[PDB]
Amino acid sequence: KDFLPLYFGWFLTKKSSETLRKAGQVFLEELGNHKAFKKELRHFISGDEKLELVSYFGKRPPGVLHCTTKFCDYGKAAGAEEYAQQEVVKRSYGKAFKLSISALFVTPKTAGAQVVLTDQELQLWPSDLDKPSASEGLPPGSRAQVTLGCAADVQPVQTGLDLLDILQQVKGGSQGEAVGELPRGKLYSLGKGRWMLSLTKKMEVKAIFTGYYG
Ligand SMILES: [Cl-]
């Protein structure tokens, strides 16, 4: 039998990947400089003057940025075969999509970009994730994200988990008043080391849906 990709997802074009990557780095530099962030350092880290977040997020994706749909590990991951055999997955393979980025976020584990999927794109979102959005009362695909960085001991799956936690809080209405205004939008302090920049203008990135084999 044919084995499957390591994972499926939307791979950003070089140009869109660079645009988003650079914006994410600028966000880390702006956030680390912000007085609201510096004030809350004890809830972010356990050791001490200034924390450079670019250094803190010391593992970054090495190639182009991507929005993962289904991790398959060549067939060895749960639900991989069922995902890959879907008509819509085969139909979409190699095809171009536009992804809407609505927010950048930081936690003590990850730095990411929130993706708001279209209905057509949601058809490619897996229905069997460990800790699916629906398990927390959120719409499927809510945790779609592009990972921009993570801390030394952190794994890729963490970014979507962190986003789900942030979105659950906003749902609770504990987003709070903005604590600052950055060039690209309002900054929110969600507690427990968690920060969100809500973009005034959503960032559209071009991507191709396909399979990565490593
Ligand atoms: Cl989900």
Author numbering: 162 to 209, 213 to 378
The authors write:
2′,3′-cyclic nucleotide 3′-phosphodiesterase (CNPase) comprises 4% of total myelin protein in the central nervous system (CNS), being the most abundant CNS non-compact myelin protein4. CNPase consists of an N-terminal polynucleotide kinase-like domain10, a catalytic phosphodiesterase domain11, and a membrane-anchored C-terminal tail, which contains a cysteine residue that undergoes isoprenylation. The catalytic domain enables the rapid hydrolysis of nucleoside 2′,3′-cyclic phosphates to nucleoside 2′-phosphates.
In mouse CNPase, this is done by His230, Thr232, His309, and Thr311, in a manner, where a nucleophilic water molecule activated by His309 can attack the cyclic phosphate and a pentavalent transition state is formed. However, only H230S and H309S could be used to trap nucleotide ligands within the active site, whereas H309Q and the H230Q/H309Q double mutant could not.
